[PDB]
């Protein structure tokens, strides 16, 4: 459902969206296939079937995806008209956007059936392959396949994120934010309004959003940063029962599923961020050509 | 500070239902798995259930399953345990105990309510406890046996159940002191044979003794150890 669905234009020519639910909750089942496999080296040769089966699923997820397009095609050109309004009195093509906008978030919801078939066939494998989990004796249990797994396709993804400073991040976007506010004051007041007067305040506003989905995601990346290492180091370096086995992986592929919604999305969203930045300068400094003409 | 103080508790006419609840303050509660844990009248602790510091996972002794159900509110820091269709068996002081690790709760319990007492109105791991009751003179070096019957590694703590008091830990890892447990106490021991040494008894008469693994699901208490002075 809606609210819960995020726009990306990383590119200038590119614009695509994500119900952010079905990203996690194939994301869950993406690690609770692979938890499983990977529990006795007797069963690691089936991961060629498990990717084999997780691309035919991200393939009939992204049919359903591409019979929104034709609306999407619109919204793509209707924001191309805002971003360079050459060759067009505001308010009429900057409604248009917004239902278009709405008529899209419309369009998925109409196709919300068929998300689910595709979600469930996630769930389905990836329980046929959880449930065939076994132990030697079912009181030792080992947690090879916890340790393996992690190492392997989380901690990179860990190790990423603490190199950089996703804080300086955000602390360096706000004041993109700041400058482009005070010199777009400076502007509508040395000329007072013009079309593209208008469209710098309607991209500063847009980036404006970026801006705090970016912040709301690094902060559950934050989060599931802590939590994944700290909760880690207590479901490796032992043996469990398996009731308690299968607990423990769960609760794994619970907060890997949502620490990798957060940062796949923080960083297409800062890819959307700077790609919206360059359009916003390339109409400032015809903005400043304008305006010094006139002198 | 930590304190746990627990509610709810009086007689009930056999069969019925009553609630028990915990007032949480001075620790990060949010982060915490939470235990509820009954010893009846004269004998030892018996656990009775825990649940996950975001309150997904909980898990209950199969005496009280389909009868009792934990929850907690995180916001108003609170547990609680829903006690339905009453036995004669529920007769305890119930204990609201905090896990010493975040999140899940093993790994044993950090700190201890006082307990509310109920009076009714008429597979799992075994400890064994070597000396049940146990009469020494100040300065003796004590000692005291715990037997699993599955091989628990390491995953072995002792408490100190002062008369008529809350229990309170000493020793987490096999060996491992907490902090305010002076120097005399000590612990060692792997896999199934694990023991406690009170080297030097001091006068703080150390009442009765309980060991508790944490490997399997139950986490199994032995029976106490009676020290006299």
């Known amino acids: 459902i809606a609210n819960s669905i995020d726009i990306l234009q990383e590119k200038e020519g590119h614009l695509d969206f994500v119900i952010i639910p079905h990203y996690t909750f194939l994301d869950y089942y993406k690690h609770l296939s692979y938890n499983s496999i990977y529990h006795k080296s007797s069963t690691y040769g089936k991961y060629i079937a498990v990717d084999a089966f997780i691309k035919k699923i991200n393939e009939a997820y992204d049919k359903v995806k591409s019979k929104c397009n034709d609306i999407k095609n619109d919204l793509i050109a209707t924001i191309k008209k805002l971003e360079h309004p050459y060759d067009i009195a505001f308010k009429k093509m900057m409604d248009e956007y917004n239902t278009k906008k709405k008529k899209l978030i419309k369009c998925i919801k109409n196709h919300e059936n068929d998300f689910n078939k595709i979600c469930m066939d996630m769930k389905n494998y990836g329980t046929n392959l959880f449930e065939q989990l076994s132990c030697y004796n079912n009181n030792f249990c080992n947690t090879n396949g916890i340790r393996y797994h992690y190492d392997e396709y989380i901690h990179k993804l860990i190790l990423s994120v603490k190199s950089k400073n996703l804080n300086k991040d955000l602390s360096d976007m706000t004041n993109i934010l700041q400058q482009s506010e005070l010199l777009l004051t400076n502007l509508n007041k040395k000329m007072g309004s013009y079309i593209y007067i208008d469209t710098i305040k309607f991209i500063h506003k847009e980036m404006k959003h970026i801006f705090n989905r970016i912040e709301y995601h690094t902060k559950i990346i934050n989060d599931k940063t802590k939590i994944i290492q700290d909760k880690i180091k207590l479901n490796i370096w032992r043996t469990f029962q398996k009731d308690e086995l299968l607990k423990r992986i769960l609760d794994m592929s619970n907060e890997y599923s949502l620490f990798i919604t957060s940062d796949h999305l923080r960083q297409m969203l800062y890819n959307t961020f700077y790609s919206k930045e360059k359009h916003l300068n390339n109409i400032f400094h015809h903005l400043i050509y304008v305006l010094q003409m006139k002198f | 500070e930590v304190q746990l103080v627990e509610s709810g508790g009086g007689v009930v006419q056999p069969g019925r239902s009553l609630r028990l609840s915990c007032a949480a303050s001075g620790f990060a509660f949010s982060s915490y798995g939470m235990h509820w844990v009954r010893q009846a009248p004269g004998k030892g602790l018996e656990w009775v259930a825990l649940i996950w510091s975001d309150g997904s996972n909980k898990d209950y002794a199969d005496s009280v399953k389909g009868r009792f159900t934990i929850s907690r509110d995180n916001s108003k820091s609170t547990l609680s345990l829903q006690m339905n269709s009453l036995r004669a068996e529920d007769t305890a002081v119930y204990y609201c105990a905090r896990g010493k690790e975040e999140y899940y709760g093993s790994g044993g319990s950090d700190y201890w309510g006082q307990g509310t007492l109920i009076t009714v109105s008429s597979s799992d791991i075994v400890m064994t406890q070597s000396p049940s009751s146990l009469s020494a003179s100040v300065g003796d070096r004590v000692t005291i046996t715990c037997r699993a019957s599955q091989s628990i590694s390491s995953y072995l703590h002792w408490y100190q159940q002062k008369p008529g008091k809350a229990p309170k830990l000493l020793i987490y890892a096999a060996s491992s002191l907490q902090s305010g447990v002076p120097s005399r106490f000590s612990g060692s021991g792997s896999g199934t044979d694990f023991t406690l040494t009170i080297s030097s008894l001091q006068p703080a008469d150390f009442a009765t003794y309980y060991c508790?693994?944490?490997?399997?699901?139950?986490?199994?208490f032995g029976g106490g150890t009676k020290v006299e002075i």
């Open positions: 508790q693994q944490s490997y399997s699901t139950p986490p199994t």
